[PDB]
RNA sequence: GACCUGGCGGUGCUUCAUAUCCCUCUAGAGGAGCCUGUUCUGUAAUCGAUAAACCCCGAUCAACCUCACCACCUCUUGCUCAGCCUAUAUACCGCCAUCUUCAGCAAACCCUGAUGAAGGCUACAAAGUAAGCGCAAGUACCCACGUAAAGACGUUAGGUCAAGGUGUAGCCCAUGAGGUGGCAAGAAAUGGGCUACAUUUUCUACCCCAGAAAACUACGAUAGCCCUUAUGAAACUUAAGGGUCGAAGGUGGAUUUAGC
RNA sequence: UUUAAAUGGUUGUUUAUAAAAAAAUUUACUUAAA
């Protein structure tokens, strides 16, 4: 489409959070559980609104 | 001992599918997603809704086709779209399949507010992966 | 009569590749290769395994860690498991005079390998590794023991040891593969030359969480700016100075260099550290390869992979544990 | 058809709180300020006082949606960790996986 | 994007499993899942309740449920009004009364709708999801009794009276409350004007001229009272002209002609009517070959829009018409035209597809070389429409004329994916013309194989659970290609199905087997095959078995032989 | 909740507590061992207890060349349909209950001189239909392990003969 | 039962020409259906002496969100209809700086695509 | 909305369109308690007064 | 009587343990104050865990609510085609502890012991072949290191009917539901943790070249008391800050924890 | 050859067969007449 563009990748985010192993008791033993969300940016340049 | 979503070995006879056979520690290392939304990802919301929503649907799609699933859902959301991804088998009758698939289209359209397509996959029976 | 709940078909059921189930796998991979060519407006003659990998990753993109559970298209013969073909004909009688030994391929070259060294006797390196047992197993298609696997490479080797003709050596290196052995020799990095001239050298240094970038400047007086302060007032502490001086100590170059470098992230003592790392190896740019060998080996060079670990969960750190409680 | 009696009790509680939110910030933004006579805050103290009991939202209970666990619950989904591990240990939360590092 | 020949059309599921397989199929499972839908609709219309909480943004007015009971309770004017939109006659009518009773006013409008609901549904509640021959017009009706009842009579009370009673076949009372019309001075509609030229022309039998003079004087009513006609004025000319068939061919075509004059565009369905009314039963079809080669000169590349309801009929009486001119040009022409921008739209309902297909593709394999033959054989089928099995036949035939009889085994599978398995017809067509003459080795082979799979078919019957009929020529056909392609063996089988069946073998069947056995020189089975030929009595057994008794028969053998007969 | 609802395999599995503490080590013995039972065996899709006869689905789609209509089964008939249900239900519970004479060896409760049947036939399109096999002697032997105790293991003494000479034991 | 059980058609795959105009099998984003896509294409972490499973029954390529609707072949033809909405940017404006004097002031704004109802 | 939900499926499996596995298995033992002699006594006239 | 298998032996020999058994190395706990569990006692006033494998444990959390407790009052087809945190974790699913800081489990066969319970290796080889599972390999994190994760079959009828579901038994004008108010203390003992006893210290500036402090006005409370503020409808109580106050404590008995 | 080192309530820790079946829909317009 004729449309100036750049790629980069901006870093990733992992959240990580810790749960409980065991039904009942048991504090420590746990389960580790996390989201990774990775990221990619395409910057277009001098278009018009159409 | 570690139980969570691990099917136990038999004596080698027990017929296990290719999701069935890999505990949780493989969710990103060999088996995907059952479903994908953007609730989850950093930043987003309603992460909470899309949860209930994902509940109620396997589970009223494992009503509606009794005896038909031969796995689990592939649920899918783009946009204001959900898509049904379900392999069943080739037992019930054809008619019976597009009456259902007309029935669950309309009635999940008109209580979540969206357009609902459902896309079956037929198969002769169970994919066995391995016999534990 | 008590009927004895009889076996299904085996559950097991073990899957085996008839010969003919192999040929009708590579028609459809042709047929296939075809497809994917036409899909991705490409030249079906000279359409590539590489090219076919880049179309499955596009068109079917996974993020699964392991890359075999990922999506592949390849020939069914990198696919599918070796076989053995069938050892006995239509009357029964096997192909091979050591069949019944039930490793004929294994013997069978334990007997040819004992023939070559009656008939030498009778007649009178570093790149080179001997085959593995798991490779060696793949060339006889035929499940090996440790001991097993011994023995032929003790007659592998005893036919070396002894004189040989152009045809044992040869047979011998059927059994012998390429190692490329890593060269420790540190690189040396481009001497570039500034607007004015000055020959410099650029590198980098990381410790711990701190990164450095080091520009030393071949001819100087001994000035070192640290994000353009002077080292002394950067670094107050004594054995942070220390560090700093270590890399043109040892190499007898102190007051013969400029240096201006830039370092962020890390604490004082790891700045310093990632500061030496990155002006030794610019500096290797100036001296002669054995003092940069000199360098390596004083371990002035290497990125040090010391780095702090991770507390874990039902402990007190990385490795304290809570109090334990017999009782 | 809640999970249970405990639950219910909650879901009133909402709705009350919603019902009142208005005119507890009305009546509570006289009380919280120096400007008004005391005498003035001192019939708004008794005014919001007097409004029903399960309209406080300090009542309210963030319980887990499909069991009703009062503790244990994770905010982001709503869900106990006992259902939130059964629903991610099965792949069923979209990109929710284990962590190792 | 293009359609994709190789796939069924877009509605269904693309699974091999829930993919239609044949006409049939594809009409019942678009059904079953209408159905599905209907269901689906009517517990949403049931229990409101549960699909009323609105999560959606922006709001899909069309995702909610519907409310079809009226929830005005006061009987008032403008409560009734609301029974009237909801299109409840018998709730209308009864409140409506209720209404008159107590005394209060009705303004004449929602009198008037009152009567549109009444007068458009003759008195009789619309289909609703769950709670032909002959006059539907009735005498004891609420439209008339509330008609009487009105205190003043404007022209749109009687105009919908008349239309009312013309749609349900009231044609003759329609015509006498229209010269009430005239008595009392008003003037009416076009829309009422339409519907009274259908009533002259329904209403009484009378030769075409009296009907002409009629419909004429009509026209002439229309043009005294300002009304300009309208485009279904002209239609329903067309189309009640058509009972007479060849009196109103140059009337029809002056009705046509005037249309052009005045302004009025002819629409689709004015052709249709046109085509309908010039192509009757006649070996000739000089006229009808003039009218629509005329008719598609006009229509060249021209985009429709709706515009009658009969609008759909066109492409199917064109192709009709093409096939019993047998030109091919011209069907190309029509196809073309359905083809230009989304004129394709106006194919019509399913039954209308088919039958514009059938009589295409019919024409093609008949009129075109073979090679252009089979590109519109994969492009049409299955992607467009399921074959009838006769449109195999002909595609058979049109394989044999070019002499490209190595397609044969493809129809074969195909015909058995498209729901022709156990059709008799085209069994018997294909193992005919593939044992009609000898054929290389190689094609033999695998006449041989489509052979077998034939049997497998007639042995497989579903007809089994009533009987299982095997034809003899079916019978003679699969015989005789198995020996071609040198299978003997499951050619011996086949002897003893002739006398179980009681199917008389051919002698062209008998004197190939001779090579057969003599090939493999044993008297034993040439005995076999004069002992059966015998049985039946077969002229050239006798003659037959002495020259085998001359080539190969043992001694005890030749005696027993003439003693048989 | 219709949340809280759980499939069938989990119901069946937990009330049927075939893998415990109790069955380990000869724990519990219970006569009243609990049977599983398929509750979805009769169950036909489109069937309620409303009647509803939705057409493609609980009846055909099409009767008389063209397409039913929703219609509801009348009380009256409804009725006899639930009625049939529960007589087939006792049908099937019926059978279940009827016990087939097994023909006592040496005594009621032994094994001695019970026939096996024939020996299976073998790999190489080998038959022994000739060949009767009777069972001598079931004897529950017990060996101690570290991990286990008492690990139980069964010793069978079986004779086979084709009733013409030819004849053999193993265990 | 008349008949036997149902048989299941051939795959579709097996009329598809190595030449065809693939955008027309998958003009929009469709779940991956193994009798429409002639790829022989094997997912899943192979047991010991194992093949990746086929493409029949795979949920685990069921599951990718895969990309056969936009094959370069199919992105040009998109992008060739799509030049018709297209106008064209000043050419005055060659740099930020021509930019910054003839359009002083930019006003940013931010749009976010979530999957959900709302 | 958990009054929906249960309601909903509630009505959905009286009307033949959903099977509720979980509801069939309490109906199952409903009814073995009922030969049995464990049925619920009529509210009011209890075992006790 | 004689054996088989296992266990055990203050049983032999040999080789070893790598935060590990001893010797050794470093910082701690047991002494003080305070915080927070538990046991006992107390209260009209929950429950569960409770050698290793309980004891800042279910709780990533109790002023009302939460709540299941107590007192009083009220309701009876009841938010639910009811309900029950009523009994049974010795009926169970689910999720786990433990050996495991393990490497074994094992179908199907074959052979040995005269065809007994059972047993099955020697490589210059003598009866074992072994699918599958675990280990391993792979993968995550910064490497191929390390750390995570993983860790079968079984052991302790180990933990959990109080996450939820559920078998059996029990309650149904009450063992169900709702409202108001209220209890959650310390004679005593004890686990874990926090802050200290100081000069390698205390305060200020600074963030490492300083000035002061340094024993009855020193070091030392996050305690007590008073006041203010924050949240809340509600605070003697929860938290934060300020003022006042300046106690025990002077390096800790037997014993004991963690770390390559 | 080579210090001393006692105790642990009662009873409970092992055998008879296995599994349902179903049913079809039943190939190609428009129109009209009396
Ligand atoms: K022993
Ligand atoms: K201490
Ligand atoms: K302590
Ligand atoms: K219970
Ligand atoms: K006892
Ligand atoms: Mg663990
Ligand atoms: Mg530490
Ligand atoms: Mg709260
Ligand atoms: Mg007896
Ligand atoms: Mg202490
Ligand atoms: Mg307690
Ligand atoms: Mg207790
Ligand atoms: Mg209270
Ligand atoms: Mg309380
Ligand atoms: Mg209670
Ligand atoms: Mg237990
Ligand atoms: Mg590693
Ligand atoms: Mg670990
Ligand atoms: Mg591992
Ligand atoms: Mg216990
Ligand atoms: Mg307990
Ligand atoms: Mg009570
Ligand atoms: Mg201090
Ligand atoms: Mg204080
Ligand atoms: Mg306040
Ligand atoms: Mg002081
Ligand atoms: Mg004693
Ligand atoms: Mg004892």
Same mark, same amino acid.
């Given at each position: ?24 008791i048991?504090?420590?033993?746990r ?20 | ?28 290392? /060999?088996?995907?997603?059952?479903? +994908? ?24 799609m ?19 779209? +959900? ?5 069943? +088998? ?26 609902? /397509? ?13 016999? +534990? | ?32 290769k ?5 899909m991705?407006?490409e ?60 490793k ?49 490479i ?7 040891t002894?004189?040989?003709?152009? *045809?044992?050596?040869?047979?011998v290196?059927?059994f ?49 700016k ?45 700045? *310093?550290? *990632?500061i ?17 060998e ?16 991770r ?17 | 058809?809640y ?7 909650d ?15 009305? %009546? ?6 120096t %400007? ?7 019939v ?23 069991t ?33 590092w | ?9 877009y ?6 499993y ?19 839908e ?70 004449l ?54 239309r ?11 015509l006498?409350?229209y ?65 007479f ?12 002609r ?13 052709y ?7 192509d ?11 009218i ?6 006009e ?8 515009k ?24 190309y ?20 597809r ?11 394999c ?32 049109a ?17 058995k994916?498209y ?15 593939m ?24 042995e ?13 020529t ?40 001779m ?27 006798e ?9 190969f ?13 | ?21 109790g069955?380990?080590?000869?724990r ?32 055909p ?19 006899k ?6 007589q ?12 087939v004479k ?52 069964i010793?069978?003494?079986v ?13 | 039962?008349?008949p ?86 000043p ?24 999957s959900?109802?709302? | 909305?958990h ?21 069939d298995?309490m ?5 073995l308690?009922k ?11 209890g075992?006790?007064?």
């Amino acid at each position: 489409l004729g449309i100036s563009i750049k790629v980069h990748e901006p870093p990733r985010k992992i959240e990580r959070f810790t749960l409980l192993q065991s039904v009942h008791i048991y504090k420590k033993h746990r389960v580790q559980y996390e989201m990774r969300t990775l990221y990619r940016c395409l910057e277009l340049e001098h278009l018009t609104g159409s | 001992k570690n139980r969570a979503a691990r099917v136990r070995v038999s004596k080698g006879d027990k017929p296990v599918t290719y999701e069935e056979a890999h505990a949780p520690h493989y969710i990103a290392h /060999r088996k995907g997603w059952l479903s +994908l939304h953007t609730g989850n990802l950093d930043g987003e919301d309603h992460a909470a809704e899309r949860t209930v929503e994902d509940v109620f649907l396997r589970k009223f799609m494992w009503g509606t086709f009794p005896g038909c699933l031969a796995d689990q859902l592939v649920l899918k959301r783009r946009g204001n779209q +959900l898509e049904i991804c379900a392999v069943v +088998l080739r037992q019930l009758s054809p008619h019976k399949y597009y009456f259902l698939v007309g029935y669950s289209e309309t009635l999940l359209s008109y209580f979540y507010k969206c357009p609902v /397509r459902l896309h079956l996959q037929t198969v002769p029976s169970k994919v066995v992966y391995k016999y +534990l | 009569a008590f009927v004895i709940p009889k076996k299904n078909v085996p559950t097991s059921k073990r899957e085996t590749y008839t010969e003919d189930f192999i040929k009708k796998q590579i028609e459809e991979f042709n047929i296939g290769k075809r497809h994917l060519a036409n899909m991705m407006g490409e030249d079906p003659e000279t359409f590539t395994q590489e090219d076919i990998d880049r179309a499955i990753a596009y068109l079917f993109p996974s993020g699964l860690f392991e890359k075999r559970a990922r999506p592949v298209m390849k020939h069914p013969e990198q696919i599918f498991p070796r076989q053995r073909a069938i050892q006995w004909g239509e009357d029964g009688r096997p192909f091979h005079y050591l069949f019944y030994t039930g490793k004929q391929s294994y013997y069978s070259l334990m007997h040819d390998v004992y023939g070559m060294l009656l008939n030498l006797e009778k007649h009178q390196v570093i790149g080179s590794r001997w085959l593995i047992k798991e490779e060696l197993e793949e060339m006889l298609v035929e499940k090996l023991s440790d001991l097993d696997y011994m023995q032929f490479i003790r007659l592998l080797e005893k036919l070396l040891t002894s004189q040989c003709g152009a *045809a044992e050596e040869e047979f011998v290196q059927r059994f012998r593969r390429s190692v490329t052995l890593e060269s420790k020799k540190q690189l040396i990095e481009p001497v570039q030359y500034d607007e004015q001239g000055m020959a410099f050298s650029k590198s980098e240094g990381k410790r711990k969480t701190a990164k450095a970038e080091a520009i030393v400047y071949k001819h100087g007086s001994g000035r070192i700016k640290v994000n353009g302060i002077d080292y002394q007032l950067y670094f107050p502490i004594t054995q942070d100075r220390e560090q700093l001086m270590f890399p043109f100590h040892f190499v007898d170059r102190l007051g013969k260099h400029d240096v201006t470098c830039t370092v962020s992230g890390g604490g004082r003592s790891a700045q *310093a550290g *990632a500061i030496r790392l990155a002006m030794a190896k610019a500096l290797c740019s100036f001296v002669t390869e054995d003092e940069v060998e000199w360098m390596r080996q004083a371990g002035l060079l290497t990125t040090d992979p010391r780095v702090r670990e991770r507390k874990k969960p039902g402990q007190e750190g990385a490795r304290r544990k809570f109090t334990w409680k017999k009782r | 058809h809640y999970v249970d009696w405990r639950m219910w009790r909650d879901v009133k509680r909402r709705k009350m709180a919603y019902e009142y939110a208005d005119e507890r910030l009305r %009546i509570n933004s006289l009380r919280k300020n120096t %400007i008004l006579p005391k005498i003035l805050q001192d019939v708004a103290d008794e005014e919001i006082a007097a409004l029903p009991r399960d309209s406080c939202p300090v009542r309210i209970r963030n319980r887990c949606v499909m069991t009703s666990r009062p503790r244990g619950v994770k905010r982001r989904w709503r869900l106990s960790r006992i259902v939130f591990r059964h629903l991610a240990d099965h792949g069923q939360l979209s990109g929710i996986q284990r962590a190792t590092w | 994007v293009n359609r994709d020949t190789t796939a069924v059309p877009y509605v269904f599921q693309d699974d091999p499993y829930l993919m239609p397989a044949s006409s049939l199929e594809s009409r019942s499972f678009l059904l079953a899942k209408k159905s599905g839908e209907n269901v689906a609709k009517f517990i949403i219309n049931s229990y409101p309740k549960y699909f009323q909480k609105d999560i959606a943004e922006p709001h899909i007015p069309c995702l909610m449920p519907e409310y079809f009971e009226p929830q005005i309770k006061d009987i008032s004017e403008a409560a009734l009004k609301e029974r009237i939109e909801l299109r409840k006659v018998k709730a209308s009518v009864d409140m409506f009364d209720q209404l008159l009773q107590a005394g209060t006013t009705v303004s004449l409008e929602t009198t008037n709708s009152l009567l549109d609901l009444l007068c458009y549904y003759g008195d009789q509640e619309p289909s609703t999801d769950y709670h032909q021959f002959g006059v539907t017009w009735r005498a004891k009706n609420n439209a008339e009794r509330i008609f009487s009842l009105m205190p003043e009579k404007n022209e749109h009370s009687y105009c919908t009276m008349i239309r009312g009673m013309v749609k349900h076949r009231a044609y003759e009372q329609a015509l006498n409350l229209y010269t009430e019309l005239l008595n009392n001075r008003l003037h009416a509609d076009v829309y009422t004007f339409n519907a009274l030229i259908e009533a002259t022309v329904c209403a009484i039998n009378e030769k075409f001229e009296e009907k002409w003079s009629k419909i004429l004087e009509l026209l002439r009513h229309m043009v005294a009272q300002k009304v300009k006609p309208n485009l279904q004025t002209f239609n329903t000319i067309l189309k009640c002209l058509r009972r007479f068939h060849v009196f109103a061919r140059s009337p029809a075509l002056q009705v046509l002609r005037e249309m052009k004059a005045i302004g009025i565009e002819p629409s689709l369905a004015t052709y249709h009517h046109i085509i309908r009314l010039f192509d009757q039963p006649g070996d000739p079809l000089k006229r009808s070959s003039f009218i629509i080669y005329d008719i598609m000169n006009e229509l060249m590349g021209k985009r429709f829009s709706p515009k009658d309801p009969d609008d759909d009929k066109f492409f199917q009486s064109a192709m009709s018409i093409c096939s019993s001119l047998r030109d091919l040009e011209l069907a190309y022409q029509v196809h073309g035209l359905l083809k230009t921008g989304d004129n394709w739209k106006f194919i019509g309902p399913d039954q209308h597809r088919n039958f514009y297909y059938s009589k295409f593709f019919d024409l093609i394999c008949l009129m075109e070389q073979i090679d252009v033959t089979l590109k519109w054989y994969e492009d049409l089928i299955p992607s467009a429409y399921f074959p009838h099995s006769q449109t195999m036949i002909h595609l058979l035939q049109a394989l044999d004329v070019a002499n490209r009889l190595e397609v044969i085994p493809k129809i074969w599978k195909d015909s058995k994916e498209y729901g022709h398995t156990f059709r008799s017809d085209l069994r018997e067509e294909i193992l005919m013309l593939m044992a009609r003459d000898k054929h290389p080795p190689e094609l033999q082979v695998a006449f041989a194989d489509c052979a077998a799979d034939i049997k497998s078919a007639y042995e497989s019957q579903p007809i089994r659970q009533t009987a299982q009929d095997w034809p003899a020529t079916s019978l003679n056909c699969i015989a005789i290609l198995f020996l071609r392609a040198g299978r003997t063996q499951e050619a011996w089988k086949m002897l003893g199905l002739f006398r179980k069946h009681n199917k008389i073998p051919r002698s062209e069947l008998l004197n190939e087997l001779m090579d057969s056995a003599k090939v493999s020189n044993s008297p034993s089975q040439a005995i076999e095959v004069v002992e059966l030929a015998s049985a039946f009595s077969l002229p050239i057994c006798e003659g037959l078995t002495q020259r085998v008794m001359s080539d190969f028969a043992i001694n005890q053998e030749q005696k027993e032989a003439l003693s048989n007969l | 909740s219709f949340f809280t609802k759980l499939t069938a395999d989990e119901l069946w599995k937990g009330a049927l507590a075939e893998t415990g503490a109790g069955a380990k080590k000869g724990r519990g013995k219970r006569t009243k061992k609990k049977k599983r039972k398929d509750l979805n065996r009769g169950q036909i899709i489109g069937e309620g207890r409303y009647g509803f006869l939705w057409p493609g689905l609980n009846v055909p789609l099409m009767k008389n060349g063209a397409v039913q209509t929703i219609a509801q089964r009348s009380k009256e008939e409804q009725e006899k349909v639930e009625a049939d249900m529960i007589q087939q239900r006792e049908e099937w519970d019926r059978k279940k209950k009827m016990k087939v004479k097994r023909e006592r060896g040496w005594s009621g409760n032994s094994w001695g001189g019970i026939s096996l049947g024939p020996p299976d036939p073998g790999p190489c399109g080998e038959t022994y239909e000739d060949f009767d096999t009777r069972i001598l002697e079931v004897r529950n032997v017990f060996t101690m392990t570290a991990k286990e105790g008492r690990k139980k293991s069964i010793r069978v003494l079986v004779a086979v003969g084709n009733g013409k000479g030819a004849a053999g034991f193993s265990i | 039962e008349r008949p036997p059980r149902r048989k299941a058609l051939p795959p579709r795959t097996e009329k598809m020409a190595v030449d065809q105009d693939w955008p027309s099998v998958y003009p929009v984003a469709a779940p991956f259906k193994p009798s429409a896509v002639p790829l022989p294409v094997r997912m899943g972490y192979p047991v010991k002496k194992g093949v990746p499973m086929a493409k029949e029954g795979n949920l685990e390529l069921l599951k990718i969100p895969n990309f056969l609707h936009l094959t370069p072949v199919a992105i040009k033809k998109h992008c060739e209809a799509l030049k018709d909405f297209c106008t064209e940017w000043p050419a005055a404006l060659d740099s930020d700086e021509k930019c910054e004097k003839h359009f002083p002031i930019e006003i940013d704004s931010t749009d976010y695509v979530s999957s959900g109802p709302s | 909305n958990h009054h929906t939900y249960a309601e909903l499926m509630q009505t959905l499996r009286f009307l033949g369109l959903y099977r509720d596995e979980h509801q069939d298995f309490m109906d199952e033992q409903k009814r073995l308690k009922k030969l049995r002699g464990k049925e619920k006594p009529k509210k009011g006239e209890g075992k006790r007064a």
